[PDB]
């Protein structure tokens, strides 16, 4: 269907959905002419790295005599641009065959994606209409745990409830009671901020203001929000949002030089390069945020270094990647002899792999379900009368059934199992934004951890000695509505 | 719809609705009445006839999504490569 994709033929096809662009153009349609299309604007290198992770995992599986002998995996990977419409077009392309069959061409056995929660919901409706398994890597909303609506959804990322409980614990740990809240008006910010509100109500914490912001917000809403922020006495603000939806507000705040505010970040924008820029430090320095657990993929960087726009005939996204990396045309003209290590872009300038490891784990979980089908002993199956599933002709519902009961080993030696709701628990790390002494950029220094496996009250660990407040200070700030009443 | 849980030990089948709602039938009859009245009226849209195609949702996303997939067949096949519905009423 959609062009610019990355495709490769095989016996079994796996679909993909990755954000290669942050968003779409701001063109408005007055319906005077026939609506044509919307073009995407800002290239996202991190999404390209996630796509490369998926391709690398598939190629590794295709070269293993151990896993899936005599079977070759193909793929059809599209771009979503963090928008529902493009992902819906790609999903229609995916379910072409099943839709033609039911209502009255390649067949995909499973789909990997997507990043956003609204996009994932819109995709999951259509995919559960046909019982096609869908394993996401970055959707952490709690509404996707409802199995009476989403029947074939699984995720390799933890749920967002423990994160809100952890922010409540962090606020209680420093002995604050006067805070404010900001969330994104989507399926990711509202439930998390509601859970945080409940937890804060439990622990005797007063919330002054609560605002909803969006990437598609006009000047008036931003002015009102910044007036609300200026207009109060609280210095601690909890934000449940992502970088694209948070950029306008941060730009306006850095315009007005609003300083002295302590920010707590959710995992979405705790490492966002759209927010972690030098020109915002005096506003955003000293932020305390969450992060997932890093993983190791041996030989992945070497694969990342081998991109060349001419050799890769199975990846149509590499041309724009090269043009954006080296600023030429393949207004100078590209030669193809440049080196990726030269320019500093998020493609290979990374410290830990957190979402790429999720993509790797999702691909390997699908492969292990396929292997479990391929090794079914006679009369010892998970189907009626102990029957097995023919590996020569497989179907999406059998793969989903094997995914619901899966238990395999990682390369690092850990057990990966989905619960009854298709979720996977994990630890959290707590980081603080500092400034590089030499480079001058924002550095993410770990200050603690949150252990979801412990018991309540012993799940948090923080070193205050490593924490710089507002980026420079060593004294803990003061966020209380009123001063303490003493003896007498 | 019914509460039959899917064990996925056999090929999944379609789900069945349970209770009957007369208020929704009255709303459907209201739509049919409006269309017939418009057709009978000569001043409004002369020399043309208004048709319709109405389905059941059963307060479930899946049934309405199946009906909507039926609604956009021609546009879908045109974009990815039966009379078309100009407008939809619901849900
Ligand atoms: C700000 O207010 C909080 C109460 O919301 C104070 O926390 C109390 O601190 C005392 C002494 O450390 C404890 O005995 C109480 O149990 C705390 N109350 C709680 C946690 O709800 C805090 O001390 C105040 N800080 C300042 C600087 O005024
Ligand atoms: C999640 O965090 C806990 C807490 O740090 C980890 O528990 C540690 O486990 C290692 C060995 O696996 C021990 O050496 C440490 O002493 C433990 N720390 C404790 C108990 O505070 C745990 O391994 C992490 N990961 C998982 C999957 O639970
Ligand atoms: O559900 C959601 O919308 C977020 C999106 C998101 C998360 N982590 C990210 C890292 C980079 C980019 C986007 C994200 C967590 N789940
Ligand atoms: C903030 O307080 C000032 C003080 O009068 C007021 O003029 C302004 O309207 C207030 N803004 C908001 C958003 O409450
Ligand atoms: C903004 O605030 C910082 C911190 O006090 C100060 O150094 C800088 O001069 C201010 N800039 C403007 C334009 O007010
Ligand atoms: C998965 O298998 C391991 C054995 O390697 C077992 O210890 C573990 O309990 C299994 N998972 C579950 C959820 O039972
Ligand atoms: Ca193999
Ligand atoms: Ca996406
Ligand atoms: Ca980002
Ligand atoms: Ca008429």
PDB file of N, CA, C and O in Angstrom, chain A residues 222-270:
ATOM      1  N   UNK A 222      -2.157  28.322  25.705  1.00  0.00           N
ATOM      2  CA  UNK A 222      -0.819  28.382  26.286  1.00  0.00           C
ATOM      3  C   UNK A 222      -0.689  29.585  27.211  1.00  0.00           C
ATOM      4  O   UNK A 222      -0.105  29.487  28.297  1.00  0.00           O
ATOM      5  N   UNK A 223      -1.219  30.739  26.796  1.00  0.00           N
ATOM      6  CA  UNK A 223      -1.166  31.920  27.655  1.00  0.00           C
ATOM      7  C   UNK A 223      -1.919  31.682  28.955  1.00  0.00           C
ATOM      8  O   UNK A 223      -1.443  32.053  30.033  1.00  0.00           O
ATOM      9  N   UNK A 224      -3.092  31.052  28.874  1.00  0.00           N
ATOM     10  CA  UNK A 224      -3.851  30.748  30.083  1.00  0.00           C
ATOM     11  C   UNK A 224      -3.075  29.807  30.998  1.00  0.00           C
ATOM     12  O   UNK A 224      -3.027  30.006  32.219  1.00  0.00           O
ATOM     13  N   UNK A 225      -2.449  28.778  30.422  1.00  0.00           N
ATOM     14  CA  UNK A 225      -1.714  27.808  31.229  1.00  0.00           C
ATOM     15  C   UNK A 225      -0.522  28.468  31.912  1.00  0.00           C
ATOM     16  O   UNK A 225      -0.256  28.225  33.096  1.00  0.00           O
ATOM     17  N   UNK A 226       0.219  29.309  31.184  1.00  0.00           N
ATOM     18  CA  UNK A 226       1.375  29.963  31.793  1.00  0.00           C
ATOM     19  C   UNK A 226       0.933  30.995  32.825  1.00  0.00           C
ATOM     20  O   UNK A 226       1.633  31.230  33.816  1.00  0.00           O
ATOM     21  N   UNK A 227      -0.232  31.616  32.628  1.00  0.00           N
ATOM     22  CA  UNK A 227      -0.775  32.492  33.661  1.00  0.00           C
ATOM     23  C   UNK A 227      -1.099  31.703  34.924  1.00  0.00           C
ATOM     24  O   UNK A 227      -0.842  32.160  36.043  1.00  0.00           O
ATOM     25  N   UNK A 228      -1.659  30.506  34.760  1.00  0.00           N
ATOM     26  CA  UNK A 228      -1.971  29.642  35.894  1.00  0.00           C
ATOM     27  C   UNK A 228      -0.686  29.257  36.620  1.00  0.00           C
ATOM     28  O   UNK A 228      -0.629  29.264  37.855  1.00  0.00           O
ATOM     29  N   UNK A 229       0.354  28.918  35.856  1.00  0.00           N
ATOM     30  CA  UNK A 229       1.614  28.490  36.461  1.00  0.00           C
ATOM     31  C   UNK A 229       2.275  29.646  37.206  1.00  0.00           C
ATOM     32  O   UNK A 229       2.721  29.493  38.349  1.00  0.00           O
ATOM     33  N   UNK A 230       2.359  30.815  36.566  1.00  0.00           N
ATOM     34  CA  UNK A 230       2.886  32.008  37.222  1.00  0.00           C
ATOM     35  C   UNK A 230       2.084  32.359  38.466  1.00  0.00           C
ATOM     36  O   UNK A 230       2.628  32.868  39.452  1.00  0.00           O
ATOM     37  N   UNK A 231       0.778  32.095  38.432  1.00  0.00           N
ATOM     38  CA  UNK A 231      -0.150  32.794  39.307  1.00  0.00           C
ATOM     39  C   UNK A 231      -0.242  32.120  40.669  1.00  0.00           C
ATOM     40  O   UNK A 231      -0.869  32.667  41.582  1.00  0.00           O
ATOM     41  N   UNK A 232       0.369  30.947  40.817  1.00  0.00           N
ATOM     42  CA  UNK A 232       0.291  30.156  42.034  1.00  0.00           C
ATOM     43  C   UNK A 232       1.611  30.196  42.800  1.00  0.00           C
ATOM     44  O   UNK A 232       2.624  30.716  42.325  1.00  0.00           O
ATOM     45  N   UNK A 233       1.583  29.628  44.006  1.00  0.00           N
ATOM     46  CA  UNK A 233       2.751  29.582  44.873  1.00  0.00           C
ATOM     47  C   UNK A 233       3.479  28.248  44.854  1.00  0.00           C
ATOM     48  O   UNK A 233       4.603  28.173  45.361  1.00  0.00           O
ATOM     49  N   UNK A 234       2.874  27.199  44.303  1.00  0.00           N
ATOM     50  CA  UNK A 234       3.526  25.899  44.263  1.00  0.00           C
ATOM     51  C   UNK A 234       4.728  25.929  43.327  1.00  0.00           C
ATOM     52  O   UNK A 234       4.718  26.586  42.283  1.00  0.00           O
ATOM     53  N   UNK A 235       5.776  25.203  43.714  1.00  0.00           N
ATOM     54  CA  UNK A 235       6.995  25.119  42.929  1.00  0.00           C
ATOM     55  C   UNK A 235       7.264  23.731  42.372  1.00  0.00           C
ATOM     56  O   UNK A 235       8.303  23.532  41.732  1.00  0.00           O
ATOM     57  N   UNK A 236       6.372  22.772  42.594  1.00  0.00           N
ATOM     58  CA  UNK A 236       6.555  21.395  42.150  1.00  0.00           C
ATOM     59  C   UNK A 236       5.429  21.057  41.181  1.00  0.00           C
ATOM     60  O   UNK A 236       4.248  21.119  41.543  1.00  0.00           O
ATOM     61  N   UNK A 237       5.788  20.704  39.948  1.00  0.00           N
ATOM     62  CA  UNK A 237       4.826  20.433  38.886  1.00  0.00           C
ATOM     63  C   UNK A 237       5.072  19.027  38.359  1.00  0.00           C
ATOM     64  O   UNK A 237       6.202  18.685  37.990  1.00  0.00           O
ATOM     65  N   UNK A 238       4.019  18.216  38.323  1.00  0.00           N
ATOM     66  CA  UNK A 238       4.086  16.863  37.782  1.00  0.00           C
ATOM     67  C   UNK A 238       3.477  16.869  36.386  1.00  0.00           C
ATOM     68  O   UNK A 238       2.351  17.343  36.192  1.00  0.00           O
ATOM     69  N   UNK A 239       4.216  16.345  35.410  1.00  0.00           N
ATOM     70  CA  UNK A 239       3.810  16.384  34.010  1.00  0.00           C
ATOM     71  C   UNK A 239       3.694  14.959  33.484  1.00  0.00           C
ATOM     72  O   UNK A 239       4.667  14.196  33.517  1.00  0.00           O
ATOM     73  N   UNK A 240       2.507  14.610  32.994  1.00  0.00           N
ATOM     74  CA  UNK A 240       2.257  13.350  32.296  1.00  0.00           C
ATOM     75  C   UNK A 240       2.029  13.670  30.823  1.00  0.00           C
ATOM     76  O   UNK A 240       0.897  13.924  30.405  1.00  0.00           O
ATOM     77  N   UNK A 241       3.098  13.651  30.034  1.00  0.00           N
ATOM     78  CA  UNK A 241       3.000  14.050  28.637  1.00  0.00           C
ATOM     79  C   UNK A 241       4.195  13.503  27.869  1.00  0.00           C
ATOM     80  O   UNK A 241       5.044  12.793  28.414  1.00  0.00           O
ATOM     81  N   UNK A 242       4.244  13.841  26.584  1.00  0.00           N
ATOM     82  CA  UNK A 242       5.355  13.534  25.702  1.00  0.00           C
ATOM     83  C   UNK A 242       5.909  14.831  25.127  1.00  0.00           C
ATOM     84  O   UNK A 242       5.271  15.885  25.198  1.00  0.00           O
ATOM     85  N   UNK A 243       7.117  14.744  24.555  1.00  0.00           N
ATOM     86  CA  UNK A 243       7.807  15.903  24.039  1.00  0.00           C
ATOM     87  C   UNK A 243       7.088  16.678  22.955  1.00  0.00           C
ATOM     88  O   UNK A 243       7.029  17.912  23.028  1.00  0.00           O
ATOM     89  N   UNK A 244       6.555  16.018  21.921  1.00  0.00           N
ATOM     90  CA  UNK A 244       5.787  16.766  20.911  1.00  0.00           C
ATOM     91  C   UNK A 244       4.604  17.529  21.482  1.00  0.00           C
ATOM     92  O   UNK A 244       4.315  18.643  21.028  1.00  0.00           O
ATOM     93  N   UNK A 245       3.911  16.965  22.471  1.00  0.00           N
ATOM     94  CA  UNK A 245       2.779  17.641  23.092  1.00  0.00           C
ATOM     95  C   UNK A 245       3.196  18.650  24.154  1.00  0.00           C
ATOM     96  O   UNK A 245       2.354  19.431  24.606  1.00  0.00           O
ATOM     97  N   UNK A 246       4.468  18.656  24.558  1.00  0.00           N
ATOM     98  CA  UNK A 246       4.954  19.553  25.593  1.00  0.00           C
ATOM     99  C   UNK A 246       5.787  20.708  25.057  1.00  0.00           C
ATOM    100  O   UNK A 246       5.992  21.687  25.780  1.00  0.00           O
ATOM    101  N   UNK A 247       6.253  20.624  23.811  1.00  0.00           N
ATOM    102  CA  UNK A 247       7.149  21.642  23.260  1.00  0.00           C
ATOM    103  C   UNK A 247       6.590  23.063  23.291  1.00  0.00           C
ATOM    104  O   UNK A 247       7.334  23.977  23.682  1.00  0.00           O
ATOM    105  N   UNK A 248       5.331  23.339  22.870  1.00  0.00           N
ATOM    106  CA  UNK A 248       4.851  24.732  22.874  1.00  0.00           C
ATOM    107  C   UNK A 248       4.884  25.396  24.243  1.00  0.00           C
ATOM    108  O   UNK A 248       5.299  26.554  24.377  1.00  0.00           O
ATOM    109  N   UNK A 249       4.445  24.663  25.269  1.00  0.00           N
ATOM    110  CA  UNK A 249       4.419  25.216  26.619  1.00  0.00           C
ATOM    111  C   UNK A 249       5.827  25.534  27.106  1.00  0.00           C
ATOM    112  O   UNK A 249       6.066  26.590  27.703  1.00  0.00           O
ATOM    113  N   UNK A 250       6.774  24.631  26.852  1.00  0.00           N
ATOM    114  CA  UNK A 250       8.151  24.856  27.284  1.00  0.00           C
ATOM    115  C   UNK A 250       8.757  26.031  26.527  1.00  0.00           C
ATOM    116  O   UNK A 250       9.509  26.833  27.095  1.00  0.00           O
ATOM    117  N   UNK A 251       8.436  26.157  25.238  1.00  0.00           N
ATOM    118  CA  UNK A 251       8.919  27.296  24.461  1.00  0.00           C
ATOM    119  C   UNK A 251       8.401  28.608  25.034  1.00  0.00           C
ATOM    120  O   UNK A 251       9.158  29.571  25.199  1.00  0.00           O
ATOM    121  N   UNK A 252       7.108  28.661  25.360  1.00  0.00           N
ATOM    122  CA  UNK A 252       6.550  29.883  25.933  1.00  0.00           C
ATOM    123  C   UNK A 252       7.161  30.188  27.296  1.00  0.00           C
ATOM    124  O   UNK A 252       7.461  31.349  27.610  1.00  0.00           O
ATOM    125  N   UNK A 253       7.358  29.157  28.123  1.00  0.00           N
ATOM    126  CA  UNK A 253       7.940  29.364  29.446  1.00  0.00           C
ATOM    127  C   UNK A 253       9.364  29.891  29.329  1.00  0.00           C
ATOM    128  O   UNK A 253       9.757  30.820  30.047  1.00  0.00           O
ATOM    129  N   UNK A 254      10.160  29.315  28.426  1.00  0.00           N
ATOM    130  CA  UNK A 254      11.531  29.787  28.243  1.00  0.00           C
ATOM    131  C   UNK A 254      11.534  31.178  27.625  1.00  0.00           C
ATOM    132  O   UNK A 254      12.491  31.945  27.790  1.00  0.00           O
ATOM    133  N   UNK A 255      10.470  31.527  26.897  1.00  0.00           N
ATOM    134  CA  UNK A 255      10.323  32.901  26.428  1.00  0.00           C
ATOM    135  C   UNK A 255      10.110  33.860  27.591  1.00  0.00           C
ATOM    136  O   UNK A 255      10.705  34.943  27.629  1.00  0.00           O
ATOM    137  N   UNK A 256       9.268  33.482  28.553  1.00  0.00           N
ATOM    138  CA  UNK A 256       8.949  34.359  29.674  1.00  0.00           C
ATOM    139  C   UNK A 256       9.920  34.241  30.844  1.00  0.00           C
ATOM    140  O   UNK A 256       9.747  34.957  31.837  1.00  0.00           O
ATOM    141  N   UNK A 257      10.923  33.366  30.759  1.00  0.00           N
ATOM    142  CA  UNK A 257      11.934  33.223  31.809  1.00  0.00           C
ATOM    143  C   UNK A 257      11.309  32.876  33.160  1.00  0.00           C
ATOM    144  O   UNK A 257      11.570  33.525  34.175  1.00  0.00           O
ATOM    145  N   UNK A 258      10.474  31.842  33.174  1.00  0.00           N
ATOM    146  CA  UNK A 258       9.889  31.351  34.417  1.00  0.00           C
ATOM    147  C   UNK A 258      10.826  30.302  35.003  1.00  0.00           C
ATOM    148  O   UNK A 258      10.971  29.207  34.451  1.00  0.00           O
ATOM    149  N   UNK A 259      11.461  30.632  36.124  1.00  0.00           N
ATOM    150  CA  UNK A 259      12.482  29.789  36.727  1.00  0.00           C
ATOM    151  C   UNK A 259      12.050  29.389  38.133  1.00  0.00           C
ATOM    152  O   UNK A 259      11.012  29.825  38.638  1.00  0.00           O
ATOM    153  N   UNK A 260      12.862  28.542  38.764  1.00  0.00           N
ATOM    154  CA  UNK A 260      12.602  28.100  40.117  1.00  0.00           C
ATOM    155  C   UNK A 260      11.583  26.994  40.256  1.00  0.00           C
ATOM    156  O   UNK A 260      11.171  26.694  41.382  1.00  0.00           O
ATOM    157  N   UNK A 261      11.164  26.374  39.157  1.00  0.00           N
ATOM    158  CA  UNK A 261      10.140  25.339  39.182  1.00  0.00           C
ATOM    159  C   UNK A 261      10.789  23.964  39.119  1.00  0.00           C
ATOM    160  O   UNK A 261      11.678  23.728  38.294  1.00  0.00           O
ATOM    161  N   UNK A 262      10.344  23.064  39.991  1.00  0.00           N
ATOM    162  CA  UNK A 262      10.822  21.687  40.029  1.00  0.00           C
ATOM    163  C   UNK A 262       9.896  20.838  39.172  1.00  0.00           C
ATOM    164  O   UNK A 262       8.675  20.839  39.374  1.00  0.00           O
ATOM    165  N   UNK A 263      10.472  20.117  38.215  1.00  0.00           N
ATOM    166  CA  UNK A 263       9.716  19.307  37.274  1.00  0.00           C
ATOM    167  C   UNK A 263       9.931  17.827  37.555  1.00  0.00           C
ATOM    168  O   UNK A 263      11.063  17.385  37.776  1.00  0.00           O
ATOM    169  N   UNK A 264       8.841  17.067  37.550  1.00  0.00           N
ATOM    170  CA  UNK A 264       8.888  15.612  37.572  1.00  0.00           C
ATOM    171  C   UNK A 264       8.386  15.087  36.237  1.00  0.00           C
ATOM    172  O   UNK A 264       7.286  15.440  35.800  1.00  0.00           O
ATOM    173  N   UNK A 265       9.190  14.248  35.596  1.00  0.00           N
ATOM    174  CA  UNK A 265       8.931  13.789  34.243  1.00  0.00           C
ATOM    175  C   UNK A 265       8.492  12.332  34.238  1.00  0.00           C
ATOM    176  O   UNK A 265       9.024  11.499  34.978  1.00  0.00           O
ATOM    177  N   UNK A 266       7.511  12.033  33.393  1.00  0.00           N
ATOM    178  CA  UNK A 266       7.166  10.657  33.090  1.00  0.00           C
ATOM    179  C   UNK A 266       8.192  10.081  32.121  1.00  0.00           C
ATOM    180  O   UNK A 266       9.043  10.792  31.583  1.00  0.00           O
ATOM    181  N   UNK A 267       8.108   8.769  31.897  1.00  0.00           N
ATOM    182  CA  UNK A 267       9.099   8.099  31.063  1.00  0.00           C
ATOM    183  C   UNK A 267       9.077   8.589  29.621  1.00  0.00           C
ATOM    184  O   UNK A 267      10.091   8.471  28.925  1.00  0.00           O
ATOM    185  N   UNK A 268       7.957   9.151  29.162  1.00  0.00           N
ATOM    186  CA  UNK A 268       7.846   9.554  27.763  1.00  0.00           C
ATOM    187  C   UNK A 268       8.804  10.691  27.427  1.00  0.00           C
ATOM    188  O   UNK A 268       9.543  10.620  26.438  1.00  0.00           O
ATOM    189  N   UNK A 269       8.808  11.752  28.236  1.00  0.00           N
ATOM    190  CA  UNK A 269       9.609  12.936  27.949  1.00  0.00           C
ATOM    191  C   UNK A 269      10.781  13.110  28.905  1.00  0.00           C
ATOM    192  O   UNK A 269      11.403  14.175  28.916  1.00  0.00           O
ATOM    193  N   UNK A 270      11.110  12.089  29.698  1.00  0.00           N
ATOM    194  CA  UNK A 270      12.259  12.192  30.589  1.00  0.00           C
ATOM    195  C   UNK A 270      13.582  12.167  29.837  1.00  0.00           C
ATOM    196  O   UNK A 270      14.607  12.568  30.399  1.00  0.00           O
TER     197      UNK A 270
END
